[PDB]
Each structure stands twice: as structure tokens, then as C-alpha cells.
Write a protein that binds this DNA or RNA. Structure first.
Lengths: 147, 151, 81, 150, 127, 25, 91, 97, 97
RNA sequence: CGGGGGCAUCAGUAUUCAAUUGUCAGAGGUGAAAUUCUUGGAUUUAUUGAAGACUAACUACUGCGAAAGCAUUUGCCAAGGACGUUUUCAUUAAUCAAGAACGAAAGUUAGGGGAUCGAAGAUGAUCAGAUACCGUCGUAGUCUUAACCAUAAACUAUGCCGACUAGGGAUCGGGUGGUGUUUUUUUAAUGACCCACUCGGCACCUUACGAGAAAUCAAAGUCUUUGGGUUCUGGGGGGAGUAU
């Protein structure tokens, strides 16, 4: 979203992340389990935001049988772990640091390094993060991100 | 003359050694002997009268003021309640929803008692008789037997 | 098939059947005596224990119950008798 | 099987052949009867006593090492309860479902399950009345059962 | 090197809308739809009308100053077909042959987590 | 005719014969 | 014995008023003339005195409530709303 | 008599499956009965890809696709798609092609 | 459960029900534990906690009213406080109770 | 272990409406049109909001439930089958006139809600006519709370309990075994997987010993070589589920 304009130069701030539907649509393949988890949570400077996640079970590379679904308590366990990791990574310092997490996607690495003792769990992403409360305009904190 | 019960609530006078009895409308759930907390920094319990700026959105209050200081105007017959649906913290205002469904923006310093007003569900019982309508309007005014203007 | 000894079945065909569906039914479960190396005395734990059987002197743990066989708690030494 | 379901599950204990010995077995019948009485002091049903003797000590069946089953050892030592254990736990289940149904009146599933539990209770009570371990015209009434359990 | 727009092709059946906007999505340049280039009311969705509409839209876009575009093909969606009409392909090609540059193409059909009852009755739109 | 439209017609017959017989109770 | 079949308490009205009007009265006159459990002493002594007023016999506490029942269906969910909204404040 | 052992389709162990709508006529058909095919196609057709990949910065960039699952009724799938009508012995087959 | 633990003290231990017999056993130093029902009046609960701290007795609070505390002691009346005079072979003293 | 139930909670886009923005002649809808909405800028675009319903994709010859039925999250509440078991009681069981609980949709009563679709109704075409199909608008209804109703092609058109008879490989839930794979921390440990077996499910495939009037059927077999226990129903088609 475009926050401040200084003379034919209109400056912006992070307003959200979302997938393109061809990428999100190509991952939902049949004969596996889809896992969705979201958390509505605050940040250091008070950006209240809802950050989503997705995961999919996969085959081990010795598995013969067709599908490899989870078992519906593995889903609850993985959702618990995902939500705890997200509400750990948020309420670190603010969405400057959260976008500097989301760009190299370290969140997926933490998810797959925590849930691997539950289920194999391929193709993990963050898939969205949407703003539902901005604290204040705070022009100095804005221009801290425009050198 | 009224369907809702009333509650005598006694308070300590802050400036003189005496007691001040006020007559609230009894919200549903209150009982004699309960401590009622009136003020800005009071808690969100049933019976406590709070300003509307200090309650979250979706709080169900009754006996809510219109102007801050007019001691109770809206949602005041039996069973009724307003819903605080939103805040505008600058120019501090509060959008509430009146019992007629009409939305209304009012001051965030106007007060109201949490809960709905007792005696509710009163009009679900048929009067069945002209005697009950007689004794109903006997303590209100004089307009019971209103002959149709066409006759 | 069409001629077999149903009175003397082979042991490999009998060790695989359900414990009720063998020729004379008998339990596939056992007992075992356990000593925790802190104490000295031994105690007799069922294989399918269902309780947190603690040692006699130091009440700590010897087996946590599970779906089937009990799990001996990783510092143990057991003999099937 | 399953008088009040449609399940056909065969899951039970396969009692061994030998009606004597553990010849790996220690201390004799007086001590395991003493243990039975000691556990029955603690408020244990014979099912729980037999479980606790089976796993903690090595006691295969109390009818094998001792002379009788655990209800005769409880009853001959003045410790058998007023109503039998299975009727007790059925009445306990009916009391718990009735508390849930006064909390959750919209639940038709608990209504159906409560009718199944009480219809089980009445068949057990008719049996125990016929064999006369219960007095005649003993009646499970749904009001006093909550105290009758405890 | 370029300066981008976003092309917002919505090709249903019964019509095809080209219309480019600014990269913000607020300010629109060059609207022309597919049924403005024929008046025969059946060929509003036909790909020749989509080609003619996209050619006019590319002419006005090249005039205003937009030299590249970020297309977002769309179908009706919602409780409707979620399949683009016949004039969505050709318009795209007629937007790329003209001299407009193409970047970052995707598909933005609005798809529910399913929702409100689909029109047509329970036995369906039978005929 | 289709059996539920004879069933609906029969219910319309019975609803009439309940009405004419109600006038003479 | 069982004295009336279906009129119950509303047999005092006799043959008058219309049966569907005496059915809606019977739904509420059973509720307003019944004894309810006291929340405070745990005894079944709470009787209505006037519309919206419910007094307990022993421990003598008078609780405000619905006109024909102690707790209406509207005000019960209100008490659990404000219960929910308050614990979003202390947490 | 019975024309299929699996009568309409694929309901053994339920009693009720929640229905979907046909994509063509909006006839409401059960989800297991319907007829279900996933259409996976590019947003460009096989002629347009040359002229489009000429007309792009970021060379060829994705060839991005399009995915939707089509549920037909028995009428409108016979009327176009998956029909012909199979003989009594060729009916029992379940290999797709 | 806690209700299983109380059921053994009724059948194998010594106890007193009611308020006036409970605060008597506080005054004699004969109480081991008092279980107060939830719907007791707060003033009665305040002195029963005060009579305990003068005798260094532990107070347990029941999770229910006086109707269901009298149920756990196996009686058809309602008790407001039960005072354990003597743990028998039960284990209310050695548990969190 | 499960999409079994109840209550609360949470989310998701979409649809409809509304607010502001941008641009300019159409937009809908169809086999083709017309009614309809459009300088009151409709349709289209972007930001935000409200409302109610629904819970897509994952979603299958897969799960749970007595059936009807049940698919977002989380918490609480009670329940259940299967498995495991050298725990207990010891015939307590099977099926059931009368009787009882539950029972899709529509419908009924009284509030709440009313976005969408939409019996009636009003309209535009079609047509010889069109009280229809197709198009637009829309009432009750759809949703919920308290109470009725007690019917469905409520279907597997196949009562329930028990035993025996045939070959196969898949799958779901539980369990047992493996000097098997994977996850490294350094060996482990668990989970996932693989192999073999095992109960208990939803099913499937090939045969036919057997049955059948045949279609077809591992039950619809173990029936003129007729008897395991038990409940309900039928007796040419109508009249007629009519009259009383």
C-alpha cells in the first residue's frame, strides 16, 4: 500500500503476501493429505496480522502404496507445531524483519525441521499473510525503510 | 406501570458522610447483596455500569446514555439491549445498534450497564382478558378502550 | 488340502495363527523378571503389563503401558521367566 | 456378539491349559491371599485386584494359585461390595450420561446411548435378582442412582 | 526499460472484456470490451471480436504511454463456470502481437470455499 | 397416469369428501 | 387421579379464550409457578413474586430474571458473551 | 433388473454423500455419482505460445497452467464427454484411457 | 479421581459433615482436611479458611455445589463442608487433596 | 481410532448489498432473442464495510454412526467400536406381539434471521395453443431457537443371531515379529515406510463346487439328499391403500 508521497515519488510499505493460483493450485494433487493452519497475532510494533500456512504429506522413498494420507491426529499435531512456530517467529521484531524472514523462507525450514518427527510432510509454504490492523502512520518509521 | 424490575443500589457519598440510594433498572442476573462497580476503570461484569469507550466491540449493555450525563436513555424496557458494534477512537465515538435495529453513533463517554434488562419475554403471554388489559393500563395512562374511529 | 493332519499341525503353521484359533488355545504372552541396576532384587513383570510397574524399593518405573506389549523403560535387564 | 451394537469382535483372554502352577512361581497361597485382602482394603474391585496382581507380582490367575476367584476371597473375608462390580460400573455410566444429558439436552445421541445403557442395567439387575445376590424388588431408579454409586 | 500496466481480461460466455489499468489497479486506460466491435449479440464472445477489441485497446495503450502489460485472465467464477470463454485466448494473442510487451501472466478466477446455492434448480437448467 | 399424481388427486378427493361430510355432522 | 387430559393448569379458564391461546398460557404459567433451584444455597426454593423478580425462601436472596422463567435464553448467552469478552481482557 | 452392481456409483458404506452441482446444467448430483475430470491446460493454446514467448521479457517465464475439476451429471456427460455406451461386457472395465 | 478418594474415607475412615461439627474439629485439632463445597457463602468459607490456618490444617475446595458434595460422601442430603477426622486407608492426605 | 454426537469458538474465499475511486457505451441472457439495468455512468476496475448461508480443491469402490446422517480451526463435555489382555462375573444370552427412543426433505406453530437459490405469483419469448421447458423479478420456504409431523426408490428394492464351504490381491483401524529402509548427534530413540502374520471393518476381482426362471449370487450356497434359532410379510390383475 502506498503510504507517503514526496514529490513524484510515492513510497510504500508491506501490505501482504499471497500465492499465485497456478502455484497454489498445482500443489493440491490427489491421493495425499492437505494441512492448513493460520494464526492471528501481533508483532513488535503493533501490526496485527493473520499469517497462514500449508503442508502436504508425501511418500517416503521406499513406499509402495499409492497415497500416504496422514491419520487425523498427525494433522492436529502438525497444526499445533506449525501454529507454535508461527507465533514464535512473529512477536519478534516487526514486519521489516518478518519480510526479511519471508523472502529467504526460513519459516518453511523450521516447520520441516520440527514436523519431520511426526510425518514426512512435503511442500511446506506460508501461502499468505494479511494485514488486519496497522498501528499508526509513523512517518519516521516509514522512511527508515527508504534510504 | 413498568415491566422491568428495579434495583435500589446504595452508594457511599464521596464528599459527605452519608449514603446515596440510586434506583437502577435491574439487569438480568443481578441479586440483592451484589457489589456493583460504577465507573471508568470498573470491570466488564454483569451489573457494572461502564462508559462505552471502555468496553470491547460486541459488549451487550443496556440503560445506555445518549449524551454523557443524561443518566440513561436507550435500551431500557424489559428484555432489550444495545450492541456496541464499533469504535472510532479519534473524535471519540462508538457505533451501537439500538433495539429497533437502527444504528446510532454516540459518545464514548456515555455509560451503560452490562447485560440485558430483566423481566424479558414478558409479552409472549397472551392477556386473554379485557380485565388484564384493564389492569395493565390502569397503572400507566388512559387509553385502554379506544373505540375505532370508523364507528 | 483334502487330506491333512488336523491333529498334528506343523509348528510354523501354528505360530502364526490367532491365539484363539490354534488347535488348543493358549496365550502368546509371557512374564519376565526385571532388575533395575540401582537396586538388587528382581520383580516379575507381565509382558502386556498395563500399569506403570515401579521397582519395589526405588519406586521409579519399569514399564509404561501401550497398545499391546509393555515398553521397558530403557534402563533395565529382563529375562523371560 | 455385542448385544447393543453390530460389532463382531473376538478379543479376549486365552486362558492357558494348565490348571496348576507357575513352577517358576515363588511364595505360596497365603501371601497372595494376604495381598488380595490388602488391595481390597484400598477400594479396588476384583478386576483391578487381578490386574494389579497379574502385572506387578507375577500372579497368573488367582483361581490357579489360590483356591478361589477373587470375589470369593473378598466375600469370605468380609469385603465384597453391596452391588456387584459390573452393575456398579453400568450404573456409574448411566449417572454420567444423565449428567451430560441435563447439560446437553440437544444431544439425541446421548439420549439413545442412555436408553442402551439403562436397558443393559435392567437385564443385569434382573439376572442378579433371579440368582438373588440382589434383594427382590431392588430397582435401579434414575433419581437415587447418583448417590447409590458413591 | 518498459512501463507496465495490468490487462484484466475477463472472457465469459456472452462477452469478453479487455481493459488495462494502471499498475495500482485504480486508474484505468483503454477500456474497450468485446461486444463494442460487433453488434450481432451472439458474436460478442467470439474470438474475432476479442481480437478487434484487443487491437483497439493496444492502440489506446500505446498512445497513452503503456508499453508493457501484466495480464490477468479471468472467468466468471463464483457459482458460475470457472472456465474462461472463447475470446480469452485470442485477445491475449491479439494483445501480444500488436506491439505490447507481456509479463507475468496469471489466472484470477474468483473461486469459493464453496458458498451460496448455484442457480438452476435441483433438476437443473434442462432444455 | 403417474402414481404420485393419482396419489395427489386422491388426497384432493378425500379433502373434499371430508368437507362435504363435515357440513352434515 | 389424573384429573384433566391436556388443559393442565389452564383448566381454570374453562371453555373460553381459544385453545391455541390457552396453550401459550399453559407454557408460561407452568414456568412462572414452578420452583427453581437457588444458585446460592442449592435449595429448590426460588419462586417468582412479580414479573422479573425471583426470590428464594431460605437465604432470602432475590435475583432479577425473566418474566416467567428465572434465566431467559437471551440473557444466558449474554452472560457467556461477557464472560468470553472479559477473558480477552485479562489474557 | 440391476444394470450395475454399483448402482449409480460408488456408495457402499455411507448411506448419504453430499451432492455437487453439474457444471453444465446445475443439476444436483451426488459427489460420488457425478463424473469427475480434472482439466489441466495452459492459459495459452499451442499456436499462441510462439508469438507470446516472442512478446515477453523474462524468457518464456513459466508457461503457467490452469486447473479445475469438472463435475458433470450423467445426462450432460453422455451428451458430450464420456459416453459412447459400452456393451454389457465392456461395461465392467474401469481402466480410463 | 477425587470422588473415588472420598468414597473410601466414608467407608473406611472417620469424618464429620456439616459446618458446626467441622469447626468443632478445627477447635480440637482433630481435623486432617476440610473439603468445602463451591456454593458455600463466602463468609462461611472465609472463617473455615481462618480456622484452618490457626490449626495448620489443609483446605481442599470441591469442584461443585453442596448438592454434589453430599453425593460424593454417599448421602441424600446436601453437605457444605466435610471434615476428614481420620484418613483410613485412603490417600487424600498424601495426594494433592 | 473416527468427517460419531452436543455446546461454545475460529477461519476461508465466494455471493448479494453499500461507500468512495477510475474510465466511457453498452451490459445481461440465449439455440437465437426479448423483458431488464444503463450520463441516475450500467457492465468492468481498485480500497473498505455489513449480512446470512455454505465449508470447494484435499475427497477415494476411503472413515464414523442404529438408521436418518456426518467434511474449516480450537476447547470442553460425555459416548462408542475394533484391538490388546494368563483381569473380572459366570449363562447373565438370541430373536421379538404390545410398548418406547431416534427419524432426510417438504410441511405446521411462535420468535430470530432473511445473503443466495426459490413451490406460488408476475412477467419475456417459444408454440397451433404453452396455465411448460428457456430468461428476468420474487413470496412462503431455505438458516436458527422451542414444539409438532413420522413419511422417502428411508434401497443393498436383500430381517437379525450362529456354524460351515474358494482362490486372490489391494485398503482402513489395532496388535506381534524383523542382527529391514529413512530422519544424525555419534550410536541411538520415536514417527513414517517395507516385508511377513494376525484379528475386526468397507469393499473388490476370478471361478463355480453350489444356487437360481434368468439377470445374476461367497451368498441369493450348505433345499424334493427338503428341519440351526427366531421375527415380520405375501397369495391372479383391478376395484384400492378406496369406503367405513
Amino acid at each position: 500500500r502506498v503510504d507517503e508521497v514526496q514529490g513524484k515519488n510515492l513510497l510504500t510499505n508491506f501490505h501482504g503476501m499471497d500465492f499465485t493460483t497456478d502455484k497454489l493450485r498445482s500443489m493440491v494433487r490427489k491421493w495425499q493429505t492437505l494441512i492448513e493452519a493460520n494464526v492471528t497475532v501481533k508483532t513488535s510494533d503493533d501490526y496485527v496480522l493473520r499469517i497462514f500456512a500449508i503442508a502436504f504429506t508425501r511418500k517416503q522413498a521406499n513406499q509402495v502404496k499409492r497415497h500416504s494420507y496422514a491419520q487425523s491426529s498427525h494433522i492436529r499435531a502438525i497444526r499445533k507445531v506449525i501454529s507454535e512456530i508461527l507465533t514464535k517467529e512473529v512477536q519478534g521484531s516487526t514486519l521489516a524483519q518478518l519480510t526479511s524472514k519471508l523472502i529467504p523462507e526460513v519459516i518453511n525450514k523450521e516447520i520441516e525441521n520440527a514436523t519431520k518427527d511426526i510425518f514426512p510432510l512435503q511442500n511446506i509454504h506460508v501461502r499468505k499473510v494479511k494485514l488486519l490492523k496497522q498501528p499508526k502512520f509513523d512517518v519516521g518509521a516509514l522512511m527508515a525503510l527508504h534510504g | 406501570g413498568r415491566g422491568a424490575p428495579l434495583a435500589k443500589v446504595v452508594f457511599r457519598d464521596p464528599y459527605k458522610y452519608r449514603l446515596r440510594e440510586e434506583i437502577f433498572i435491574a439487569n438480568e442476573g443481578v441479586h440483592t447483596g451484589q457489589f456493583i462497580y460504577a465507573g471508568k476503570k470498573a470491570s466488564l461484569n454483569v451489573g457494572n455500569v461502564l462508559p462505552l469507550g471502555s468496553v470491547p466491540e460486541g459488549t451487550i449493555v443496556s440503560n445506555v446514555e445518549e449524551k454523557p450525563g443524561d443518566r440513561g436513555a436507550l435500551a431500557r424496557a424489559s428484555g432489550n439491549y444495545v450492541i456496541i458494534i464499533g469504535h472510532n477512537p479519534d473524535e471519540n465515538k462508538t457505533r451501537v445498534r439500538l433495539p429497533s435495529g437502527a444504528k446510532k453513533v454516540i459518545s464514548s463517554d456515555a455509560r451503560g450497564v452490562i447485560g440485558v434488562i430483566a423481566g424479558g419475554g414478558r409479552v409472549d403471554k397472551p392477556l386473554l382478558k379485557a380485565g388484564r388489559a384493564f389492569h395493565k393500563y390502569r397503572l400507566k395512562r388512559n387509553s385502554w378502550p379506544k373505540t375505532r374511529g370508523v364507528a | 488340502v483334502l487330506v491333512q493332519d488336523l491333529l498334528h499341525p506343523t509348528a510354523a503353521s501354528e505360530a502364526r495363527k490367532h491365539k484363539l484359533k490354534t488347535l488348543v488355545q493358549g496365550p502368546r504372552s509371557y512374564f519376565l523378571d526385571v532388575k533395575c541396576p540401582g537396586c538388587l532384587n528382581i520383580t516379575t513383570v507381565f509382558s502386556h503389563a498395563q500399569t506403570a510397574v515401579t521397582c519395589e524399593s526405588c519406586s521409579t518405573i519399569l514399564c509404561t503401558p501401550t497398545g499391546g506389549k509393555a515398553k521397558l523403560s530403557e534402563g533395565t535387564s529382563f529375562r523371560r521367566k | 456378539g455385542r448385544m447393543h451394537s453390530a460389532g463382531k469382535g473376538i478379543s479376549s483372554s486365552a486362558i492357558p491349559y494348565s490348571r496348576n502352577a507357575p513352577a517358576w512361581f515363588k511364595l505360596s497361597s497365603e501371601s497372595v491371599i494376604e495381598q488380595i485382602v490388602k488391595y481390597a482394603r484400598k477400594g479396588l474391585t476384583p478386576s483391578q485386584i487381578g490386574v494389579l496382581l497379574r502385572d506387578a507380582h507375577g500372579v497368573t490367575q488367582a483361581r490357579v494359585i489360590t483356591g478361589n476367584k477373587i470375589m470369593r476371597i473378598l466375600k469370605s473375608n468380609g469385603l465384597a461390595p453391596e452391588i456387584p462390580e459390573d452393575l456398579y460400573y453400568l450404573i456409574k455410566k448411566a449417572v454420567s450420561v444423565r449428567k451430560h444429558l441435563e447439560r446437553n439436552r440437544k444431544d439425541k445421541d446421548a439420549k439413545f446411548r442412555l436408553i442402551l445403557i439403562e436397558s443393559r442395567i435392567h437385564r443385569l439387575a434382573r439376572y442378579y435378582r433371579t440368582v438373588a445376590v440382589l434383594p427382590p424388588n431392588w430397582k435401579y431408579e434414575s433419581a437415587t442412582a447418583s448417590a447409590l454409586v458413591n | 526499460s518498459q512501463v507496465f500496466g495490468v490487462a484484466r481480461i475477463y472472457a465469459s460466455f456472452n462477452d469478453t472484456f479487455v481493459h488495462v489499468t494502471d499498475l495500482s489497479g485504480k486508474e484505468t486506460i483503454a477500456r474497450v470490451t468485446g461486444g463494442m466491435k460487433v453488434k450481432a449479440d451472439r458474436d460478442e464472445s467470439s474470438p474475432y471480436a476479442a481480437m478487434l477489441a484487443a487491437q483497439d485497446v493496444a492502440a489506446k495503450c500505446k498512445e497513452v504511454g503503456i508499453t508493457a502489460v501484466h495480464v490477468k485472465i479471468r472467468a466468471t467464477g463464483g457459482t458460475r463456470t470457472k472456465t474462461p470463454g472463447p475470446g480469452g485466448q485470442a485477445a491475449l494473442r491479439a494483445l501480444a502481437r500488436s506491439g505490447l510487451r507481456i509479463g507475468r501472466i496469471e489466472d484470477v478466477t474468483p473461486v469459493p470455499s464453496d458458498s451460496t446455492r448455484k442457480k438452476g434448480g435441483r433438476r437443473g437448467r434442462r432444455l | 397416469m403417474r402414481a404420485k399424481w393419482r396419489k395427489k388427486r386422491t388426497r384432493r378427493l378425500k379433502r373434499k369428501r371430508r368437507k362435504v361430510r363435515a357440513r352434515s355432522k | 387421579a389424573k384429573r384433566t387430559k391436556k388443559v393442565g393448569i389452564t383448566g381454570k379458564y374453562g371453555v373460553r379464550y381459544g385453545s391455541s391461546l390457552r396453550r401459550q398460557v399453559k407454557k408460561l404459567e407452568i414456568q412462572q409457578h414452578a420452583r427453581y433451584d437457588c444458585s446460592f444455597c442449592g435449595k429448590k426454593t426460588v419462586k417468582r413474586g412479580a414479573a422479573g423478580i425471583w426470590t428464594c425462601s431460605c437465604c432470602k436472596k432475590t435475583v432479577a430474571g425473566g418474566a416467567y422463567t428465572v434465566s431467559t435464553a437471551a440473557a444466558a448467552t449474554v452472560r457467556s458473551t461477557i464472560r468470553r469478552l472479559r477473558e480477552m481482557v485479562e489474557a | 433388473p440391476k444394470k450395475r452392481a454399483s448402482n449409480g456409483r460408488n456408495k457402499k458404506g455411507r448411506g448419504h454423500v453430499k451432492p455437487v452441482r453439474c457444471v453444465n446444467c446445475s443439476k444436483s448430483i451426488p459427489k460420488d455419482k457425478a463424473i469427475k475430470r480434472m482439466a489441466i491446460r495452459n492459459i495459452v493454446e499451442a499456436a499462441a505460445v510462439r508469438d507470446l514467448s516472442e512478446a515477453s521479457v523474462y524468457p518464456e517465464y513459466a508457461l503457467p497452467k490452469t486447473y479445475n475439476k469438472l463435475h458433470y451429471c450423467v445426462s450432460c456427460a453422455i451428451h458430450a464427454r464420456i459416453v459412447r455406451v459400452r456393451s454389457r461386457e465392456d461395461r465392467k472395465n474401469r481402466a480410463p484411457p | 479421581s477425587i470422588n473415588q478418594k472420598l468414597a473410601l474415607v466414608i467407608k473406611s475412615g472417620k469424618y464429620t459433615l456439616g459446618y458446626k461439627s467441622t469447626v468443632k474439629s478445627l477447635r480440637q485439632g482433630k481435623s486432617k482436611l476440610i473439603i468445602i463445597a463451591a456454593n458455600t457463602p463466602v463468609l462461611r468459607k472465609s472463617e473455615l479458611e481462618y480456622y484452618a490456618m490457626l490449626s495448620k490444617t489443609k483446605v481442599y475446595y470441591f469442584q461443585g455445589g453442596n448438592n454434589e458434595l453430599g453425593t460424593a460422601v454417599g448421602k441424600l442430603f446436601r453437605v457444605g463442608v466435610v471434615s476428614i477426622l481420620e484418613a483410613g486407608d485412603s490417600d487424600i492426605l498424601t495426594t494433592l487433596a
